[PDB]
Design an enzyme around this catalytic site. Sequence first.
Site, PDB file in Angstrom:
ATOM      1  N   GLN A 131       7.102   0.580   5.326  1.00 22.27           N
ATOM      2  CA  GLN A 131       7.995   1.391   6.199  1.00 22.27           C
ATOM      3  C   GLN A 131       8.148   2.795   5.600  1.00 22.27           C
ATOM      4  O   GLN A 131       7.998   3.778   6.354  1.00 22.27           O
ATOM      5  CB  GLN A 131       9.358   0.704   6.352  1.00 22.27           C
ATOM      6  CG  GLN A 131      10.383   1.492   7.164  1.00 22.27           C
ATOM      7  CD  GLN A 131       9.915   1.829   8.560  1.00 22.27           C
ATOM      8  OE1 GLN A 131       9.209   1.057   9.206  1.00 22.27           O
ATOM      9  NE2 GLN A 131      10.314   2.996   9.042  1.00 22.27           N
ATOM     10  N   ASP A 162      16.200  -8.344  -3.454  1.00 26.92           N
ATOM     11  CA  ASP A 162      15.016  -8.522  -2.577  1.00 26.92           C
ATOM     12  C   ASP A 162      14.098  -9.525  -3.219  1.00 26.92           C
ATOM     13  O   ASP A 162      12.874  -9.347  -3.149  1.00 26.92           O
ATOM     14  CB  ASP A 162      14.354  -7.174  -2.265  1.00 26.92           C
ATOM     15  CG  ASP A 162      13.462  -7.205  -1.029  1.00 26.92           C
ATOM     16  OD1 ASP A 162      13.674  -8.093  -0.174  1.00 26.92           O
ATOM     17  OD2 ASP A 162      12.569  -6.324  -0.922  1.00 26.92           O
ATOM     18  N   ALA A 166       6.668   3.878   2.374  1.00 25.72           N
ATOM     19  CA  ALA A 166       5.580   4.301   1.459  1.00 25.72           C
ATOM     20  C   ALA A 166       4.285   3.505   1.675  1.00 25.72           C
ATOM     21  O   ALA A 166       4.320   2.437   2.316  1.00 25.72           O
ATOM     22  CB  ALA A 166       6.051   4.175   0.034  1.00 25.72           C
ATOM     23  N   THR A 167       3.189   4.039   1.122  1.00 27.53           N
ATOM     24  CA  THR A 167       1.809   3.480   1.120  1.00 27.53           C
ATOM     25  C   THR A 167       1.342   3.367  -0.336  1.00 27.53           C
ATOM     26  O   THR A 167       1.641   4.290  -1.118  1.00 27.53           O
ATOM     27  CB  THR A 167       0.857   4.329   1.982  1.00 27.53           C
ATOM     28  OG1 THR A 167      -0.494   3.966   1.691  1.00 27.53           O
ATOM     29  CG2 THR A 167       1.007   5.821   1.774  1.00 27.53           C
ATOM     30  N   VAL A 168       0.636   2.288  -0.685  1.00 31.94           N
ATOM     31  CA  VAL A 168       0.284   1.956  -2.098  1.00 31.94           C
ATOM     32  C   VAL A 168      -1.232   2.013  -2.274  1.00 31.94           C
ATOM     33  O   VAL A 168      -1.943   1.406  -1.452  1.00 31.94           O
ATOM     34  CB  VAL A 168       0.851   0.589  -2.532  1.00 31.94           C
ATOM     35  CG1 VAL A 168       0.553   0.313  -3.998  1.00 31.94           C
ATOM     36  CG2 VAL A 168       2.342   0.492  -2.254  1.00 31.94           C
TER      37      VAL A 168
END
EC number: 2.7.11.22
Lengths: 65, 279, 286
Positions: free
Chosen positions: C13, C113, C15-17
């Site tokens: 949602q 989480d 960030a991108t890894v």
Amino acid sequence: ALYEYQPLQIETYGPHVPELEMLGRLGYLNHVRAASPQDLAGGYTSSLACHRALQDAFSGLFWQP
Amino acid sequence: MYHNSSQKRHWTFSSEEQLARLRADANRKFRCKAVANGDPVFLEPHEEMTLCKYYEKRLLEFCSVFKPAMPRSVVGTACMYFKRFYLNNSVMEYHPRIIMLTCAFLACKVDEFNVSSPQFVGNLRESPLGQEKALEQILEYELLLIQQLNFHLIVHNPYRPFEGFLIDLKTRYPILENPEILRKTADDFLNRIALTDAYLLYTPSQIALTAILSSASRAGITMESYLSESLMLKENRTCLSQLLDIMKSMRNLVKKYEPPRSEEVAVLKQKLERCHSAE
Amino acid sequence: KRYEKLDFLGEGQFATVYKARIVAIKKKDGINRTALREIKLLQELSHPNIIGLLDAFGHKSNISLVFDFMETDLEVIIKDNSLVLTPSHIKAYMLMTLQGLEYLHQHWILHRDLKPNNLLLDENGVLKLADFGLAKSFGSPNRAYTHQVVTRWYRAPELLFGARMYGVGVDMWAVGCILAELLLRVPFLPGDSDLDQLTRIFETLGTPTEEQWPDMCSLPDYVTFKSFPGIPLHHIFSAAGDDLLDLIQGLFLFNPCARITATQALKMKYFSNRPGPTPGCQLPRP
């Protein structure tokens, strides 16, 4: 190769903080605000606040840069 | 926790001399850029220091009138960000009027004090266009501020330690019958301590205890037994001597603190504006 | 900056890894509050079972967080039908989860989480708590929290009843749900809504009474439920020894105060008894 519990060895550089479960007996909780039923129902106890505040007061009192 | 914090590791310095060297290096490193690009337009380190003291006061004013009520934790964090930023940066390169707002903006996010951008810049006494310009400048510098803090965002303030000592005194030091009579004067001394470099030189616990023992000494209450008996420093007499010297050193910083003078600030402000006109 | 940018690992949602030369980089409001939360907490934490933030940097209102590169997560392990989860494997995973959690809780931070996919494993079989985007300091009375934390299947009943204040019990319940998923190889309590989640909890563990949970009725979203007997834990976990059932029982106490802490869990006979936890290098790899 059996596990054995060792407590975490973290130097605080300050006076001894009394254990969370002892705070009631030692009379600390007489000087922190009581956790409400709803607080208690969620697992928030006055002992948490009190313990955090004592730990912060004593953390690094003796430490020099 | 303070005892394994970035604050202790990286942002608690050995002496005032070491601070003055970081600030001096900042002043001469900017001068070397400005001269390399292109006179008495340049501010001297003592003048930078007067402006930083003045803007730190403007940051406190901002945070004090800020709606909704900004927690003291966020204000402490913002003021610490401001001090840290100007150890390694000139007020001639990054205007402290922008940096101080960017300090407050970042502190609100780090300390989980949820405010929207518009309600943040809503607190500025400027036109809607001015507030939108202010917001754009804050967004421009937010990453700069984080970079200059070396991405060390958690600040340990003396306020929780201060609460912990009051609990401890109320529990283990009945000689001091009502420790809450120390609160107002100890808070007043904490505020004064905060204006100095103390936050960069001592631990939050040391700062908190200095405030309490200063407030005790003003009250006439000789509570050295708390250090020796309750804190168990009668066992370790060198640790006691070391602690009493820290508190004396910290009392000495507050006594020798000169606030910025109005007429001096006016001249250095005009000088600061002139530096930013040309860059 | 100094990173080769090798392979794409996933998108989220906020960030991108990406894998980089080996590290994992996670790329008018300003900088993302979830990114700042991860930076601010992981800079103050240093423990073998907590993901290390190696470096942070970026441009404008975009930051790149650099982490140790992790090979897999527990979710992949659990869902992998090929690999057998022996009691020693389960103990090892739980031990590292709890040692990381003991350290985290000692520093007055809740993860909030916990789920198998936020328990990352490296090539050496060291488990690390990852994804601190919902992690938050606890033990402050002034601080008000949200009850929608923890993915539904691992959310503790006090959260599902709208607990604004809570403590380590929110992590320990999720630790029980992870343990239950390690033992069954399927989500323990797969609820489709906040009401279906509470139903499945009470149909499995029994409807708690005012005996088992003194102030349950004071929680703001408390709804009175049908009184179920609940399936005895030995019927659910047929292969679980008595030591493990005592651990499970303590992680699934309805009363979050009574629910076992990470340190208490760690001191339980389950961890002390035979067989010992599998060494990292011998843990199963997908």
